[PDB]
């Protein structure tokens, strides 16, 4: 056939002695998330990353590297390599302001519409390319974008995206409240599905971190979204954002915006700020960032 294209991407296998773990930066059941230095051998540069790492979990965590390792975007994290001692090691680059969902929170008296619109549009840009690549990211989340410098964002976390061919996929433990109405129903996943999830995240920025249908159980949220039921419209939100926002809930997912239409419509708002959000008051020598060091 070759209806498909060949993923001619790069899977670099990394030796141990390569890379220097420094701090736990996390703990789940799966593993830890490390953040260390990779100095590639006889390279002369040091480079921040964080490492990630035996069941049958070893198959799955390979899918994530297999989804990282394809995708090349500024505003979408690449897999820098895979360590394959005892345990299995994913090696990206280091986004030493963490996720963006802490972020928000954590400095919400410090955050002005110029960073909240710019984000928007950088997490539009990065879903808009893996649309392109036909990647369906099926876990669209504050808490699943990572923040280089507070000017510049990435999506990663990997782990449910599945890669449609040539328009939907059929799944059978999911993010219920950031899910489309068909993803619950049906478990039916689209681009339109993801953005719908971006709605949801954009929500989650506007509201500077509160969590969605806070105290509602999760088997409410179907029937309440048929009743027709959305999220509140956020207190720094004028209508033009807000509208924007309950667009990406529309029940006919093709008559939601694409993400290269937010790209525009958040552009043109990131344009002029504050006329959209209303908010008060608006160690080594041969260290290199990964972004650039190109192999
Ligand atoms: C400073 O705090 C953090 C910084 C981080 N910088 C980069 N990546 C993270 N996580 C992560 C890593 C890999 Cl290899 C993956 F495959 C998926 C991932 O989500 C980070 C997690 C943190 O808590």
Aim: with cysteine; proline share 5%; charged share 25%.
């Amino acid at each position: 056939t070759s209806g498909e294209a060949p993923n001619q991407a790069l899977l670099r296998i990394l030796k141990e002695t390569e890379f220097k773990k420094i701090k736990v930066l996390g703990s789940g059941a799966f593993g830890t998330v490390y953040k260390g230095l990779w100095i590639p051998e006889g390279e002369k540069v040091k480079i921040p990353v964080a490492i990630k790492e035996s069941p049958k979990a070893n198959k799955e965590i390979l899918d994530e590297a297999y989804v990282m390792a394809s995708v090349d975007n500024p505003h979408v994290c690449r897999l820098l390599g895979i360590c394959l001692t005892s345990t299995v090691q994913l090696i990206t680059q280091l986004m030493p302001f963490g996720c963006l969902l802490d972020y928000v929170r954590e400095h919400k008296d410090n955050i002005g519409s110029q960073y909240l619109l710019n984000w928007c549009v950088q997490i539009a840009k990065g879903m808009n390319y893996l649309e392109d690549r036909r990647l369906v990211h099926r876990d669209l989340a504050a808490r699943n974008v990572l923040v280089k410098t507070p000017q510049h964002v990435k999506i990663t976390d990997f782990g449910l995206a599945k890669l449609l061919g040539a328009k939907e996929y059929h799944a059978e433990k999911v993010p219920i409240k950031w899910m489309a109405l068909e993803s619950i129903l049906h478990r039916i996943y689209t681009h339109q599905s993801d953005v719908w999830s971006y709605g949801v995240t954009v929500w989650e920025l506007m509201t500077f971190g509160s969590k969605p249908y806070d105290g509602i159980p999760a088997s409410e949220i179907s029937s309440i979204l048929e009743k027709g039921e959305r999220l509140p419209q956020p207190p720094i939100c004028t209508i033009d954002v807000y509208m924007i926002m309950v667009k990406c809930w529309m029940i006919d997912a093709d008559s939601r915006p694409k993400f290269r239409e937010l790209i525009i419509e958040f552009s043109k708002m990131a344009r002029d700020p504050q006329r959209y959000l209303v908010i008060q008051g608006d160690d080594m020598d041969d260290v290199v960032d990964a972004d650039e060091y190109l192999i």
